[PDB]
Structure formats: C-alpha cells, structure tokens
Amino acid sequence: VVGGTEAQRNSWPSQISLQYRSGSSWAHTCGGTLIRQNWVMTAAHCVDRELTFRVVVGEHNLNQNNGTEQYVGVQKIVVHPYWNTDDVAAGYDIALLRLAQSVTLNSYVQLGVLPRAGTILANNSPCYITGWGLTRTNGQLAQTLQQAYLPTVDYAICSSSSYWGSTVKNSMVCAGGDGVRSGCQGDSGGPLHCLVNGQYAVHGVTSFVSRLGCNVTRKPTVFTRVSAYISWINNVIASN
C-alpha cells in the first residue's frame, strides 16, 4: 500500500497474509479475506504459481512475533472457472482457499462481512485498502499492516478514456487514483473495506494496478467486485 498509515492491530481482523514456502522460510505474497473459519477469499492471480501456500491470520507484523498469529496450511484451491491468467482485464480474478484447519475467532481474527449480491457503491464512497504490499512503486513490502483511504470511482468514470477505458469491467470496483495512495504489489488478493449503513463490508478483492506504477493519477487501483460473485462463493462453499 503506497501512501498508507499503520493500521491498528484490531481494526481489520478478517485480513490474512497468504505466504509461500521459500527455502527454510515463508514469504508473503498476497493478501486475502477470511470468510469462513476454514475458507479464505483471495485473487486468482495470487495462486497461479505451483507453490506451497499457507495462510496467516491474526498477523500484524510480518517480521516479528505479535503473539496473535495462527498459521494454517491451504488444503484446496478453487479458482473461478472463467479466470484466464494472461487476461486479468477480463475479470474473474477471484479464488477460494479451503484451510486445513478451522481457525479460532477472537478480536484479531474475524470473518469478513460480504455485501449483498448486486450492490454497487455510489461514486466517491469511503473505503480503505489494507495490506502488506510495497510501500513505493518498485519498493519493498511493509513490515506492519498498512491502510489507505481510497474513495471509489464509479464505472462510468473509471471506464472513461483518461482512466482505464475498456480494461475495467462492471464486475470490478475502482478506488483511489489520486496519485498519492494506492494498492501495490503484495496487496493483491486483499480486501477493499467500504463503510455502508454503518458497517464495513469487503466490497473488493485487490486485482491490479497500472504498469506505469502503483500510485498513478487516473489509474485507480482495480478490485474484483465481491458483490458480483456472491452466488459463486456460496456454491463453492456448499459443494466443498
């Protein structure tokens, strides 16, 4: 997250760190959202590689013991069947991961609340992106979980020529684009949390940014719109 601030450690308890095994160690690669005690929602493109993955819930500092972490292996990966990895702009950038164990809930570990199906945010709706991704274009991962305030940019504006044009689909949410704050590599898969009727819900799964850089004016971060996939998610969980 570029232009973020450190999150309080109990602010975003559905955020997870998706990590892969890197020699004797584990490395953060993507974010996600805990949606059942044994299921995580992330981006399809985060699980394109044939790696060994684990999820960490209750994580705040990637590089220090927080005393709140639970570490769980990934047992099954269900990627959206229309996902095509060399075509992120087509959408369907979403995957569900079934965890090997069910995690225990507490003030650091909670299920993410999803929007009702079909819900679309009014232009300029208040939202926060969270993650441990790069803090500058071509920079390094954050140590501690970051948040940035990224108001939505509606489809009509986001799909206009000076923004993303045809690349942005109505199955996506755009947020930010101020040139200062954004998602960045390592944030993919994580939540966009939007305050609606007094309650934060996870409206977006972080999908892509510009190749011109993370924080680029009129290239808002693009997320999979969770409310387009409510039936899909329920179908997968019911059938596994």
Contacts of 150 (CB under 8 A, 6+ apart): 127, 128, 129, 175, 176, 181, 182, 183, 192, 220, 221
User: Does 178 qualify as catalytic in the annotation?
Assistant: no
How many residues sit close enough to Na ion to count as binding (CB under 5 A)?
Answer: 2
User: Does 193 qualify as catalytic in the annotation?
Assistant: no
Q: Which of residues 26-85 bind Na ion (CB under 5 A)?
A: 61, 66
> For residue 117, which amino acid is it?
A
- Residue 69 annotated as lining a ligand binding site: yes
Whole-number CA gyration radius for the chain? 16
Q: How far is the CB of 176 from Na ion (least distance, A)?
A: 27
Of 93, 125, 159, 182, catalytic:
93
Q: How far is the CB of 63 from Na ion (least distance, A)?
A: 7
Beta strands across the sheet bearing 152-153: 5-6, 146-149, 127-131, 191-196, 199-208, 221-225, 172-175, 152-153
- Residue 6 annotated as lining a ligand binding site: no
Q: What are phi and psi of 152, to 5 degrees?
A: -65, 155
User: Does 93 qualify as catalytic in the annotation?
Assistant: yes
> Which residues are 221's β-sheet partners?
175
143 part of the interface to Na ion, by CB under 5 A: no
- Residue 50 annotated as lining a ligand binding site: no
- Residue 59 annotated as lining a ligand binding site: yes
List, by residue number, the catalytic residues. 45, 93, 188
Where do contacts with Na ion occur on this chain (CB under 5 A)?
Answer: 61, 66
> Residue ranges for the binding site for Ca(2+)?
59, 61, 64, 69
> Residue ranges for the binding site?
59, 61, 64, 69
